[PDB]
Every structure is written in structure tokens, then in C-alpha cells.
Amino acid sequence: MRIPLVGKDSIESKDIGFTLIHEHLRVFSEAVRQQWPHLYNEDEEFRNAVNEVKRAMQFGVKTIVDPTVMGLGRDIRFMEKVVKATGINLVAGTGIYIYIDLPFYFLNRSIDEIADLFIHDIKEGIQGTLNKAGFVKIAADEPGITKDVEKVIRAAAIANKETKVPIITHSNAHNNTGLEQQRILTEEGVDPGKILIGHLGDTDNIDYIKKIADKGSFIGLDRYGLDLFLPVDKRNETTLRLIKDGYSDKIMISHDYCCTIDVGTAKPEYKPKLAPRWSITLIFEDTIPFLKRNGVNEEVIATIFKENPKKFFS
Amino acid sequence: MRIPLVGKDSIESKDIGFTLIHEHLRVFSEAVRQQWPHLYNEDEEFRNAVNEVKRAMQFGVKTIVDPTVMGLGRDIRFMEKVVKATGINLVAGTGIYIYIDLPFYFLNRSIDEIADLFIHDIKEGIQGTLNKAGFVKIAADEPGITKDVEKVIRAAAIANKETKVPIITHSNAHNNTGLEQQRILTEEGVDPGKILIGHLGDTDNIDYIKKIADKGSFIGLDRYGLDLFLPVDKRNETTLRLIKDGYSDKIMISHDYCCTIDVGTAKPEYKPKLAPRWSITLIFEDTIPFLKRNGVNEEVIATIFKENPKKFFS
Ligand SMILES: [Co+2]
Ligand SMILES: [Co+2]
Ligand SMILES: [Fe+2]
Ligand SMILES: [Fe+2]
């Protein structure tokens, strides 16, 4: 009816339920896996993804939004297996994930051409399947808004205006990229309430986070567990403050957890260093209980994990 | 017994025959093709490659060296089908093709880890097959010698010293990257005579070219047909001058032709002006006939397309 699901019939937003807005079933570099497949283990990746999703469902997680796209190794078929194995509601997306330049393929390609790719995934289907994308993902990091990163941003705007699917972003909390993303998108006619500025939970700077929420976009406190960016307790302080300041209407919380990720930084011997208890359920284990014993009632929790996702997708 | 061939028993370097040292059966962005396969057509690509290679064999070509690696869309299985259909001697390689940064996978990974990937393709095989790489390909362009670009160059060095295979590079003829690639490789202990500094035919600055050759490396006048880099006539004038000054034993000539390329710059609309008569048989139609009628004997032609490739793979 509204929100497309992987390996399932579309559902109305009122059916989305308790959602984790930013989680990855699996992440890898398309090029390396294609060129050195001996580096990967399809079987193990599947076990880890199925196990995480099951544990999350045991906590009452009803729907999981996965922002894995070009550049992160999106694969609907793999996502489709995980769905059959768990019965989870999985929202797949489209888009391009880059930090500096686009693949050489886009050399001399218009912004419209890029947009046509997103729209294709949205209206036609993903990677040859009839599984449709329910949102579009774009990114920017340390390098800032480069010429190509902007191409992609604009392309997203075009897709959104044509399909009305929301936009989720990856940004660097310390260099105003998120703010710039929101600025460019809203200028292109994109409803701020259809944007989720991501990874804002990576900083203490409350003024900056409110600045973006005030503009009318959702704020992503979406890396709980990734201590290397910001410890759990400090994220909790921030999240609590935002809540006490009445910003639940714009808050979205998730882990950005990678059930499997090929990045050299995700090596086991580093897990303890700056990502000890990083998982897809840390939120039920630590964050929510912390907020509850700190005044935050159940209705605020529902707003964040149910209402917000619902508005975002309607 | 010396040079590995795709879908064939390795051959002595002495049996290499007339060789095109730099041609591409197919080129594409892994990430793009993987996320939007609807943009590509197997059949077309296969026919184009088969047709080109056949015409090339009708002109006396025995061996084609295809430097399509990671980033360029390497695919030995596609390469095998072509060999089975043409019977051509095809040399596949390993390496990485970047201008700026490495895929995220390499974040926090040593140069040694990268080298192990090349050594894997050379010793073990490519993409789960027993076809082995005969060389390593590296690149550098406008951005110059970035940190990740340099990490690849040093990785290639390690591979060479371990496996003995030669190194083909891609460079920018105007930014000095070619000479940089040479300095680093030699400093790492790589034999200059086992390096091919490519795309030097894009410039008519003979001084810079002679310098690279004086330092013992092969010079690649390998883009005949690509007028957008440098018209055929100016390339021919350079080639001829170099030969007159006695650089035949360092000169290697090719088209760098892509039987099919996904890049928007290679659109059939921009072909009449960026590369009018650009194919894998252009040198037989223009370059070679030009050199001959200009005082270049069969001996020198044989040195460039037969002796130099032989030496390079020894
Ligand atoms: Co992100
Ligand atoms: Co090249
Ligand atoms: Fe993410
Ligand atoms: Fe090339």
C-alpha cells in the first residue's frame, strides 16, 4: 500500500510497528568481493545476520530499515534469504554511498541519469527483483560536500519529489555536512520531515543537533555501541537532554550495527578497544532502561521507535 | 612455462608473438553493474569483444594483454568465454585501479595485506579459477600520488619481487605521475626493465618520455585512437621521433581500446569527435603503415610488438 518490503507485500505505515531505523544486515566493498571472493564467507555472514535479526525480534523489533546501497554492497537476494529465515519486516533502499568521487561510470552523466537509477529501484525493482526501495540513501563525511557528493544529494531530491520516499543520510557529526545536506535537499523542494540526518549521535554539541531538528528533519542518534565515535554514556546524556528539552518528535535511535562488515577497522581484536558491547540490541539492554529510570515514560519511547518512523514513511 | 594464459597452458615468453600490450575486452564499475545490472548487456559485450579480437587476429596479432583489474571490472570467466571463441592468447593481470582512495575494505590494512591479494592472483588463481595473473596493474592520475595510491604502488613492488611478474601502470602524461611511479618502484627494488609506464603517448613532450626510458623503463604509447588525449598524427610524430633518436627497444604501442566501456564519456554520440577511428586495429590501418613509409624497417616493428613484450615478460 505504501511501504515496500523485501520478500513481502507492501504495508501501510500504521503497520510498521517498533522499528530500528538504521541497521546493516551486511556491508562490503562491491569491487573487492567481486575481485577477491576468497576473502568472504557467505555462510557465516548469513548466520550472523539471521541470529541478530532473531534476537532483535525477541525484543519486540517488528521492522528493520537497512541503508545498505551502492558502495556498501547492497544485495536484495541476500536480504531476501534473511527475511525468509526470520519473518522480519525489512525495508530496502536505493542510493549511492560515496565520500569523494563517483565511480568512473558517472563521468559525463547528468544528475537526472543518477536520479533515474533511484527511481528505477523505487518503481521497477532492485537488482532485477520485484523488491522495491522504500527510501533513498546518500552520504558525506570528512571530505565535505564535493562536486559528486552534491550530484548525489540533488539526485535524491529528484527521486523524492517523484516518488515521495523519505531520505536517509550518512554524515560526519563534526564538520556541518549534515546541516549542508539538509540545506541542499530542502532547497530542492524536499520536505524536511522526509529527511533523516544521520550519525548526529556522534557528537556532544547539542546546539548543532537542535539546529537541524529545528529545521524540521529527524536527527539520527543512530550509532549506539560504536564507542570510537562516542561512548554509550555520553550518547545517553545527549539523548536524555534532547528528550527533556522536548525533541522526541525528531529523535530517531538505532545502532548502525553491521552483522558483518569487511572494513579493516572491524577486526575482532579491535572489538574491545572502541566497540565492546556493540550489537543490534544494546538499545534494549542499556539505552532505553537508562532513559526509563531517568523519568522518560513509555509514551516517549513509542514516539521515537514507532511514531517517528511511521511519520517518516507516510 | 613463463606467461600464464587465460583458458590455456602457459607459454614460453619466446612464443608470445605479435602482441598488443594494453587492450580491454570489457570495462565497467563493479559497484554500478552490481546495483543496476539493467544498464548492461552481456550479449553485446561478448559479441563486440569477439568481433574485435577476431579482426585483430586477422592482422597477425597473437597475444593480447588485458590490464583490466579491480576498479575496471575484471572478470576471467567473461575472459575465458572470449578465449574459447577466438583462440587468442590472453594475458590477465592483477592489481588495483584508483585515482584517489582505496575502497573502505582497506582502511587500517597494511601494504603487505594488499600485496597478498596480488600474490594470490599470481600464485593461486583469479576469482576462484585456476587462471593466473601475469602482471600487476597500478594507476595514478590528476589527483597525483595520493597516500592510498602510493600504498598500491608499494604493494605491486612486493608482488613483483615475490613473483617476478612485470608491472604495467596507468599514469597521467602531464602531471609527472609516471616518473613518480617509476621512482618509488625502483626504490623498492623493482627492476626498471620490468615496468611499463603507460599513457605517455598522450603527450608530445619527448624530453619527459626519454627521461623515463633513460631510467630503464618501457614507455607506453598505448592510446592510439583516443584523440581527446592526443590526436593520432601527433602521436605518430612522437612515436617516429623516439624511434629516430634510438628508443625502439623501450617503446611499446597499443590502443588501450575498450571493446565495451560503461563510462558516459564513451557514449556513441561523443565518439565522432573524441575518438573517430578508435578500435583495436587502428595501428594496422594508420600507425604501422605510417612508420614503414617513413624509414622504419620490419626489424624495428618486430622489436616493438614482439621483442619488447617478450623482454617485458622475462
Ligand atoms: Co553511515
Ligand atoms: Co589506463
Ligand atoms: Fe550505516
Ligand atoms: Fe587501459
Author numbering:
A (entry chain A), B (entry chain C): 1 to 314
List sentences from the manuscript:
PLLs are natural lactonases endowed with promiscuous phosphotriesterase activity. The catalytic center contained two metal cations coordinated by four histidines, an aspartic acid and a carboxylated lysine residue. Indeed, W263 is located at the start of loop 8, involved in the dimer interface of the enzyme and positions the lactone cycle of the substrate onto the bi-metallic catalytic center.
A single mutation of W263 can significantly increase the paraoxonase activity of the enzyme (by 23-fold with the W263F substitution), the oxo-lactonase activity (by 148-fold with the W263T substitution) and the activity toward the poor AHL substrate (3-oxo-C12 AHL; by 55-fold (W263V)). However, whereas detergent-induced flexibility has no effect on the lactonase activity, we isolated variants of W263 that exhibit increased lactonase activities (W263T/V/I). The residues selected in the LacSV group (T, V, I) are overall smaller than those selected in the PteSV group (F, L, M) with the exception of isoleucine (I). Mutations W263V-T therefore yield enlarged active site cavities for the lactone variants. Notably, contrary to the wild-type enzyme, all selected variants (with the exception of W263F) exhibit a substrate inhibition for undecanoic-δ-lactones with KI values ranging between 789 ± 186 µM and 7 400 ± 2 475 µM, respectively, for the W263V and W263M variants. PteSV lose their activity before the loss of the global structure (Tm), whereas LacSV do not, and exhibit a similar thermophilicity profile to that of the wild-type enzyme.
